Structure formats: C-alpha cells, structure tokens
Amino acid sequence: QVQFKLVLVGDGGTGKTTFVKRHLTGEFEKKYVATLGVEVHPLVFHTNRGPIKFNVWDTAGQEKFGGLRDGYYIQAQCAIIMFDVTSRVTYKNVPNWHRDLVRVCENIPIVLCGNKVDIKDRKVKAKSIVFHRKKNLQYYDISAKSNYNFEKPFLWLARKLIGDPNLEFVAMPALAPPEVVMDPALAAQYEHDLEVAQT
C-alpha cells in the first residue's frame, strides 16, 4: 500500500483535531497509540494514479504542555503546520513548529494551513502570511468546520510525495457534513486577497 506518515502540528486550539476528523472513515478507523499520546487517522484519498493513504498523527493535546516529545515526529514523510487565522500568536509560533519539524525530519514537504477562515472577524490576513514564501512551503486558508479547502493540503502533498503535478483526486473522501456554511462572499474575498498578496 502507498502510505505516508503525516504529522499535524501547531499550537493547541488551532483546530488540528477538528480538521483531521472531517475525514469520516479516518475517524472511524483511527488507532490510539499507548506510548506516544497519539491517534493515527488513516486518511485514504483516491487519485488518478490509484489510492494513497495519509496516516495522520494527531496529538492528544500534549502541545498544550509544551512542544511534544521527539518520537512523535520521527519517520514523518510530510506535515501540515496549522495556525488559527483569528489568533496572531498561533501564527507567530509557525517558525518554531517548522524549526522542530525540520530538526527531526529534514526537508519533508510541508503545507501551512490557516484555519477558522469561516469566522468573520479574521486577524491574520493574506498580506501578513509570508512564512511559506521564505521557507519554500505551500499555504492554504482552510475552515475545518465547513470543509472549506479540506482536500487542498492533501492534493498538494500527494503531488509532492509521488512526484507528479497533474495528479488529481478522482473522488472526494466522505466528509463530516459542514457545521457552518463557509460564507461564499468571504471565500471570494479571501481568494482575491491571496492572489493579490502573491503578486
């Protein structure tokens, strides 16, 4: 089976667990790891070159005691660093999560995700999101609760992991029905703000 360990890191409360739980089978088939304080979610996606499985390591909350232990990271093949777009301090900590990540795994492909963009009073805007630009990463706005851009980080990762740019997902995974509707107005504005920042 084509399988990658994906570690999901970032400040406590950014919505890392809410995000991974959108993938319904991934939540139903998760495996708790005694030693490590971790739940590992098998997120399978179906691409035009066959199935791929992201084994997502979600923390049990230990990041809310200080940077989790070293074994959580080892043998990761890819990563998502999350922050919260309504809390600047979580954005300020990205370089730290990245430092730890690169300290234990080297140059694994890494997607940066700004979460909770369904929330109207957004604090960390496209213009201020520059970290991915310097450290060679991919950035996406997401809203875990509305499934907004859910597939994007995993499509970009699959593209990088497999070595292929035209790779598509042939079918969407079954996702938790949205708990908020992502405001189409807000989506358009954000997409416009990103395109502008990027030029």
Residues placed in the known binding site for GTP:
11-18, 29-35, 61, 115-118, 143-145
> Smallest gap, in angstroms, from Cβ of residue 8 to ligand GDP?
8
Amino acid identity, position 145: K
Residue whose Cβ sits closest to Mg ion = 17
Task: Classify the C-alpha dihedral 161-165-169-170 as positive or negative.
Answer: negative
Residue 126, contacted partner among ligand GDP, Mg ion, none, CB below 5-8 A by kind: none
17 scored as a contact of Mg ion (CB under 5 A): yes
Residue 173, contacted partner among Mg ion, ligand GDP, none, CB below 5-8 A by kind: none
Amino acid identity, position 63: E
Residue 12, contacted partner among ligand GDP, Mg ion, none, CB below 5-8 A by kind: ligand GDP
47 scored as a contact of Mg ion (CB under 5 A): no
12 scored as a contact of ligand GDP (CB under 6 A): yes
Amino acid identity, position 36: L
146 scored as a contact of Mg ion (CB under 5 A): no
CA separation for the pair 41, 28 (Å, rounded):
8
134 CB-near residues (< 8 Å, 6+ apart): none
Strands (E) across 125-199 are located at: 138-141, 169-171
> Smallest gap, in angstroms, from Cβ of residue 15 to ligand GDP?
3
Pair 130, 156: CB distance under 8 Å: no
Pair 182, 148: CB distance under 8 Å: yes
CA separation for the pair 44, 130 (Å, rounded):
30
Contact letters for ligand GDP, residues 16-45 (x by CB under 6 A): xxx---------------------------
145 scored as a contact of ligand GDP (CB under 6 A): yes
79 CB-near residues (< 8 Å, 6+ apart): 6, 7, 8, 9, 101, 105, 108, 109, 110, 111
> Smallest gap, in angstroms, from Cβ of residue 2 to ligand GDP?
27
Residue whose Cβ sits closest to ligand GDP = 15
Binding residues (CB under 6 A) for ligand GDP: these are 12-18, 115-116, 118-119, 143-145
Binding residues (CB under 5 A) for Mg ion: these are 16-17
